[PDB]
């Protein structure tokens, strides 16, 4: 054995938030610096911040107060799966208080209009799209923030995320004081995980796309053409709460998860991820829900590894409508029409390494994943898997 050291103490515990409202990191924009909380989103590629009054914002970017502000005289429109905003392009000096000690000039979309984007009480005023330029709006010429960071400094072309779910509800006061995790910019901090790191190839550099080759519910093979699992793509997206699955995979997964938890009957609303279910304080029957394993393409030919999540991950802690002493949750898995989305739910159980430089993504058991005395999340390998390339989808 050999104890693993944490070498980025300055960035550890720099995140706050929760799966339901997103995780954010503190940033500064302009001269003098204007402090803002920014949603960490590996699912998009635009750096944008509120730049005008809004019901849900307590503060916003004030361009006229920044001596380093540069107007790009260009409008920008960004529509997500749900939620959208319109803004004005420009550049300015940007820093990360609890990150590498550097300042860089990056593109900034000043949000002037938005619909269903900002979330009441999230405590963040902007978003940080960490994905590639290919999906940046208006187009790939608008250099993403992390690209600017790497090109302008010596920070390694790599970042890692530790999203920490509490395992229980956090009120407004609590979510503000609580540590929500870590975003290590430029490296890997060994104190954030246990066990080994397994890497899966980044299939294509647009979203952080990966390939799932096998799915199990309590060790039982979901048994579908692996191509279904990646229809029309599979991405790692911290900007989305739930594990989202292709319609057919969702139907199969839900049927299998219900069968495994059959000793307990749950209403349709529950399975639709719409309504919560509650249990007497401390009695949540974790053991009746199955673990879910996702096999990922490995880096060696014909080799794969698997990540296993517990219901402590796919069941999201929520406060009871009557703020009682029950432990309540919602089913954090839902159907997609745009492929598989490995959201915050899934990320909370693992330390995820976005190794841009080696075009790969690493997974390791999170030092902060919620579990019980009987089961734990896992990252295991290797497995002999054939024709994995066939699992990828092509239009
Ligand atoms: C996160 C807190 C709760 N929310 C949002 C509020 C209900 C979700 O769980 C959620 C649910 C769905 C169902 C989509 C998105 C969604 O679109 N997330 C965005 C970011 C985001 C947007 C927003 F409005 C509010 C947020 F908090 C976070 C990702 O970038 C999507 N990546 C794929 C994609 C898909 C289409 C276009 C695209 O452009 C890059 C990227 C987010």
221 is catalytic: no
Ligand 1 mean position, distance from CA 241 (Å): 8
d(CA 329, CA 168): 9
Exposed/middle/buried for residue 383 (C-beta within 10 Å: 0-12, 13-18, 19+): middle
| β-sheet bridge partners, residue 193 | 366
d(CA 185, CA 37): 16
Element (H, E) at 147: helix 145-152
Residue of the nearest CA to atom 31 in ligand 1? 43
Element (H, E) at 355: strand 350-355
Residues 6+ apart with CB under 8 A from 269: 275
> Ligand 1 — pocket residues by CB below 6 A?
20-22, 39, 41, 43-45, 80-83, 117, 119, 135, 237, 239-242
Question: Which ligand 1 atom sits closest to the C-alpha of 117?
Answer: 24
Element (H, E) at 257: helix 247-260
d(CA 193, CA 306): 16
d(CA 122, CA 105): 27
Dihedral-angle region of residue 238 (phi above 0 means left; psi in -120 to 50 means alpha; beta otherwise): alpha
* Parallel/antiparallel/unpaired status of strands 34-41 and 126-129: parallel
Residue of the nearest CA to atom 33 in ligand 1? 43
Residue of the nearest CA to atom 42 in ligand 1? 240
225 is catalytic: no
Instruction: Choose the residue to mutate in 132, 138, 240 for probing ligand 1, maximizing ligand atoms within 8 Å of C-beta.
Output: 240
Contact between residue 189 and residue 5 where contact means Cβ atoms under 8 Å apart = no
Q: What are the b/e assignments for 57-66, b being 16+ CB within 10 Å?
A: beebbebeeb
d(CA 38, CA 41): 9
Phi and psi (nearest 5°) for 91?
Answer: -130, 165
Domain range summary for the chain, segments of one domain joined by +: 23-155, 156-395
Place of tokens 């400094």: 153
Tokens matching residue 327? 């432990």
The reply to whether omega before 232 is within 30° of 0 (cis) is yes
Tokens matching residue 27? 């940033």
CATH match of 156-395 with 2.40.70.10? yes
Angle CA 308–182–103, to nearest 5: 140
d(CA 20, CA 240): 8
CATH match of 23-155 with 2.40.70.10? yes
Question: Which among 120, 142, 169 is positioned nearest to 328, based on CA atoms?
Answer: 169
Question: Which among 279, 276, 280, 293 is positioned nearest to 375, based on CA atoms?
Answer: 293
Q: What are the b/e assignments for 257-292, b being 16+ CB within 10 Å?
A: beebbeeeeeeeebbebebbbbeeeeebeeeebbbb
The reply to whether omega before 138 is within 30° of 0 (cis) is yes
Tokens matching residue 143? 């250099």
Dihedral-angle region of residue 83 (phi above 0 means left; psi in -120 to 50 means alpha; beta otherwise): left
Question: Which among 287, 289, 312, 328 is positioned nearest to 370, based on CA atoms?
Answer: 312
Identical fold for domains 23-155 and 156-395, yes or no, is: yes
Tokens matching residue 146? 């992390």
Phi and psi (nearest 5°) for 112?
Answer: -110, -25
3-class secondary structure, 258? helix
3-class secondary structure, 348? coil
Phi and psi (nearest 5°) for 134?
Answer: -50, -35
d(CA 263, CA 160): 39
């Amino acid at each position: 054995a050999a104890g693993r050291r944490g070498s980025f103490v300055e960035m550890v515990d720099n995140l706050r938030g929760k799966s339901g409202q997103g995780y954010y990191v503190e940033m500064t924009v302009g001269s003098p610096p204007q402090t803002l909380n920014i949603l960490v989103d590996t699912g998009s590629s635009n750096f944008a911040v509120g730049a005008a009054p809004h019901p849900f914002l307590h503060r916003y970017y004030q361009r006229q107060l920044s001596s380093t502000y540069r107007d790009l005289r260009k409008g920008v429109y960004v529509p997500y799966t749900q939620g959208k905003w319109e803004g004005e392009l420009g550049t300015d000096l940007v820093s990360i208080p609890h990150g590498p000690n550097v300042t860089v000039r990056a593109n900034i979309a000043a949000i002037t209009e938005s619909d269903k984007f900002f979330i009441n009480g999230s405590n963040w005023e902007g978003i940080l799209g960490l994905a590639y330029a290919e999906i940046a709006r208006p187009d790939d010429s608008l250099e993403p923030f992390f690209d600017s960071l790497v090109k302008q400094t010596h920070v390694p072309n790599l970042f890692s995320l530790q999203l920490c779910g509490a395992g229980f509800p956090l009120n407004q006061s609590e979510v503000l004081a609580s540590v929500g995790g870590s975003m290590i910019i430029g490296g890997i901090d060994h104190s954030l995980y246990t066990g080994s790191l397994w890497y899966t190839p980044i299939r294509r550099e647009w979203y952080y796309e990966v390939i799932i080759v096998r799915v199990e519910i309590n060790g039982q093979d979901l048994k579908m053409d692996c191509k279904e699992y990646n229809y029309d793509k599979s991405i790692v997206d911290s900007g989305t709460t739930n594990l989202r699955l292709p319609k057919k995979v969702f139907e199969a997964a839900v049927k299998s998860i219900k069968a495994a938890s059959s000793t307990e009957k749950f209403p349709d609303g529950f399975w639709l991820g719409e309504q919560l279910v509650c249990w007497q304080a401390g009695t949540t029957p974790w053991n009746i829900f199955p673990v879910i394993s996702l096999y990922l393409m490995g880096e060696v030919t014909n080799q794969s590894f698997r990540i296993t999540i517990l219901p402590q991950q796919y069941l999201r802690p929520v406060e009871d409508v009557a703020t009682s002493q029950d432990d309540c949750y919602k089913f954090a898995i839902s159907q997609s029409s745009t492929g598989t989305v490995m959201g915050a739910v899934i990320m909370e159980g693992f330390y995820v390494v976005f190794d841009r430089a080696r075009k790969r993504i690493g997974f390791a058991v999170s030092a902060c994943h919620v579990h019980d005395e009987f089961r734990t999340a896992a990252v295991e390998g290797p497995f002999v898997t054939l024709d994995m390339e066939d699992c990828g989808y092509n239009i």
